[PDB]
Design a binder for this molecule. Sequence first.
Ligand code: UPG
Ligand code: UPG
Ligand code: CL
Ligand code: CL
Ligand code: CL
Ligand code: CL
Ligand code: CL
Ligand code: CL
Ligand code: MG
Ligand code: MG
Lengths: 310, 310
Amino acid sequence: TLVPDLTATDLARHRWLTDNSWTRPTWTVAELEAAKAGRTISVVLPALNEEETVGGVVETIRPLLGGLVDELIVLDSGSTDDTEIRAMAAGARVISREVALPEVAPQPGKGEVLWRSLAATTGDIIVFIDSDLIDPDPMFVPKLVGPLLLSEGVHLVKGFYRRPGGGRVTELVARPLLAALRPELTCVLQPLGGEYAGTRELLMSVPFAPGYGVEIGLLVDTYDRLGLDAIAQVNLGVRAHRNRPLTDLAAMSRQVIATLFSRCGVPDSGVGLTQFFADGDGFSPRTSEVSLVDRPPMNTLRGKLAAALE
Amino acid sequence: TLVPDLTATDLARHRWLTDNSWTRPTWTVAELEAAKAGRTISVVLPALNEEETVGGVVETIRPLLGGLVDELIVLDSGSTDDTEIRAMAAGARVISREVALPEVAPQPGKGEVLWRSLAATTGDIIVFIDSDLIDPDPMFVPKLVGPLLLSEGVHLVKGFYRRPGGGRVTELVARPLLAALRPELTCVLQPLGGEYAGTRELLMSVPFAPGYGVEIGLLVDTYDRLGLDAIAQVNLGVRAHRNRPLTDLAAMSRQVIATLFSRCGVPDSGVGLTQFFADGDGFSPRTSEVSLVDRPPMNTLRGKLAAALE
Ligand SMILES: O=c1ccn([C@@H]2O[C@H](COP(=O)(O)OP(=O)(O)O[C@H]3O[C@H](CO)[C@@H](O)[C@H](O)[C@H]3O)[C@@H](O)[C@H]2O)c(=O)[nH]1
Ligand SMILES: O=c1ccn([C@@H]2O[C@H](COP(=O)(O)OP(=O)(O)O[C@H]3O[C@H](CO)[C@@H](O)[C@H](O)[C@H]3O)[C@@H](O)[C@H]2O)c(=O)[nH]1
Ligand SMILES: [Cl-]
Ligand SMILES: [Cl-]
Ligand SMILES: [Cl-]
Ligand SMILES: [Cl-]
Ligand SMILES: [Cl-]
Ligand SMILES: [Cl-]
Ligand SMILES: [Mg+2]
Ligand SMILES: [Mg+2]
């Protein structure tokens, strides 16, 4: 809706950029573990055919297990390569989508994986880390849980990277649409980032958007329910953006739009994106589908599950 | 709104892709001029500081003047370089925004220029060609007016280019948002293209979006008023996309979104886009503004102007 009271200049100097944004986090693992105060921490790595990188990501996190980190799980998304055994050989516990929630048949896409991981974990804090990262840094998890353990009233922490400019979908799609529909959320540098942490109570009580909608849906639902102050962001360091083909990004953009529209009361047509390429006197069409149906809050399945929710 | 009856596969094979889309136009200038049937044609080149290219674009069109083309105008957008004299030396008539409509003070942006050119031209058909093109082809104008002169019921023709993949704002922003909000318009390959033609009656009767919103606003207003059949597209040939910085494209995307939202009943916040860059412990913010106010249909000023509307 129309917000004539707010300007981009206002947003450029928002107090949130000072109080809830850490460009140089200096927390130590020891003071984070001392601040757990009985809360447990689960780290979840979604993985669809990431045999080349999953072990490297796991090993950056494995030394924390039994100290800061209580559970280290790779949620296997139906991989056909060697993802599972390499994750196990690197020290992670691996759980398939079926084992995570056997009563419900798996759907494709990343949101399904993160949603199912709620039923597979027990931590009061859940940290999500992508398993395709080529150069993961071992301070990812400590930085992501810092604001949850050492600030007040934070329930969602987004990890951003400094650019040595950035992601095309982030800068052209997600952030301009957030300026139009949820302008305070443009304070978040990288709303589509895959490295973030949330408290279980929050995550059990929001729907999970399907496919690549999941990050932006969680950000907007958190903002709508709890306000900007409940969100924080932390600099995870320098990561160069790797190249993805424009055609993949366009299908992903379509789903980001559908998920944002469904959270913001915008009636999305539900129609997938067609992409055309030259042929002769006609085109070579390429289509993708979009989903407008969330997985409901995991709390709604409570008491119906053979493995009980924590 | 929700369109469960339409699918991307339906759109990939839409009859419109056959009847209103020309990948190999073979009209001759002679048969186009014979089909004018008393209609006149005005060619308008908006130009803001294009001294290096404007003359080259004009010269590709100048041989048509007095035959197919009745008026060849560069609408000078407040240039401070040598745009005006180079356009004149290349054979164009040059009209400033002030001279085009002296009763109204100029606003910045491309939409203002195209809107004012309606008052400066007399043609029954108006062709818009960007003045920054490095390699303009002399068949642009003939191809753009072909469907207007030789088809039935066409009022807007969009020129597209084959890629020797494409524009980032087009593929990630405009076309996925059109899939969500006006899915039939995803049949248009390049909705943000600057080379297009329209009939005067249509163009005098729609508002003109400001800045870079103007192309997408004209496309959606034409579709809403007249249907997909009233729109056509023609292959202008091979043009490689030149590189523009991501930060420019993000501000442009924000305005494309605001204009699309204003045509589709989506309440846009009106808040401009902030972009952040690393500094030290803080950021270097960069802001841009967005406009939600159109210029009204030029027909509404009819009879109030010292130079009468055609
Ligand atoms: O069905 C799926 C798809 C992906 N993944 C995993 O999820 C991660 C991210 O998937 P990827 O295709 O690499 O996403 P990106 O292209 O990097 O997309 C960016 O933007 C998306 C939209 O917010 C986020 O979900 C991503 O984490 C973020 O990196 C990887 O570990 C994948 O193996 C699954 O487990 N299952
Ligand atoms: O205030 C302005 C801005 C631009 N122009 C002229 O308009 C043309 C296009 O401007 P440019 O900044 O080069 O646009 P693009 O980055 O190429 O934007 C693409 O996408 C836009 C959104 O639809 C279209 O308006 C453009 O024509 C299209 O080329 C050029 O001849 C400019 O000189 C003006 O006359 N006045
Ligand atoms: Cl390995
Ligand atoms: Cl599946
Ligand atoms: Cl991105
Ligand atoms: Cl010159
Ligand atoms: Cl101006
Ligand atoms: Cl583009
Ligand atoms: Mg990735
Ligand atoms: Mg240009």
